[PDB]
Amino acid sequence: CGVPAIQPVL
Amino acid sequence: CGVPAIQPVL
Amino acid sequence: PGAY
Amino acid sequence: PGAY
Amino acid sequence: IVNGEEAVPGSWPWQVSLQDKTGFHFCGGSLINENWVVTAAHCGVTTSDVVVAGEFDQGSSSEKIQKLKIAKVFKNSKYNSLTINNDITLLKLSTAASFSQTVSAVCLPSASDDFAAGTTCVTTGWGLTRY
Amino acid sequence: IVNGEEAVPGSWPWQVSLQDKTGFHFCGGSLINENWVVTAAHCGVTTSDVVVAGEFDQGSSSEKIQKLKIAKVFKNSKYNSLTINNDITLLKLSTAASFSQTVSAVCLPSASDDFAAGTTCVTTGWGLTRY
Amino acid sequence: TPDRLQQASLPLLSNTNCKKYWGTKIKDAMICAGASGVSSCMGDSGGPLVCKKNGAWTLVGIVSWGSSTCSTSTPGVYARVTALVNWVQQTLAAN
């Protein structure tokens, strides 16, 4: 859980 | 409807 | 709130 | 509102 | 109600109390017939909540009250949570309420009805008496 | 979100959209597993509402989104509508969500976890961008 | 929170007059009342605002929202039943 396949870009 | 058996006292 |  |  | 007064017991027969399974009063409602109560959409009533009818004193254990179960919740499809517009939800009771001197229905207006500004009406409930 | 920015599509896989039968987005939520989404108690979700997963643009008709039905609503028994305290509600899905690159679960903290003031975290949603 | 059922009478206002206190939040399916020394408050929501028409109490509004501190000086806001009664009729008629 908590680790997207498409990482966030902040 | 709308006419209580125990009337309100205001 | 704000709603009741 | 007040709640979101 | 702030600055309200105590009502005569049983004089507002349609007033029901929505309580969660804990017994906590969280919202009021009005019986419109033996199988339907009307309340606010924003109350968030679910089917595990209970509708209490014929109640005057929430602290009394000797009142002949009716604890009715909710079959289905009908949230007005036009309800807007962002603006709190069209804040109305219907509750279909699994158990039908039994009307008596202390339990009965309020009347509904026709879409055409007009209630002029200045008219003195009435509102009831167990909401806070002071904030 | 006011002063937020657009997210990368599919980068917050657990973010779901609660919509009424009208198709109106009224509240967000988070998938905690294939059968459960967590949201706010004050959203007033009912079983006729729908949970949309894998969605980024609410205006697109070409996204492969998942429209999941709600089996049962579980309102935290400690929820207080007067203070809006313990504002959490669980949704059990009748249809199980299918995890993919764009749909998955957020982790839950242990009751013991501490998140220090000053920590920079993130919040997402389709809430108003300006009032 | 009172153990015993409370009551209060209060005047109805026009939406245009109410917009002076609340502005654009006052929509058409809303009707204000109060600003008269009394005020609905938290926990009253969902309850009735009844007016007597032809001898019978008729449901005119449903407690929705208002001041966050329940100020008796500002009007409360209730869902306007006339704008909703058609939906109620439709719902009862189909279940």
Next chain:
Amino acid sequence: TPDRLQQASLPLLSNTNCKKYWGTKIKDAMICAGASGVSSCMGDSGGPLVCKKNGAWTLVGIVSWGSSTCSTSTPGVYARVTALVNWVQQTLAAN
């Protein structure tokens, strides 16, 4: 209301510091964040406030309430998940 999903990062605050803006409405099962130039707003409710712990995003709060005009200068209020996680575990474990 945006068609595309929005995001924003914001600092977490202590309840005692948050009580300066909100007073006694801030309860223990609540956690504030914001007052940083960004703000959750209407329609965001129910959504996530995630913090990255040991490489994974962990659900820390759920958008509940805050300023009525979504002022970026005042902190938003979220349900504190740590105070609720035991109830979630119990609920999942029995259904």
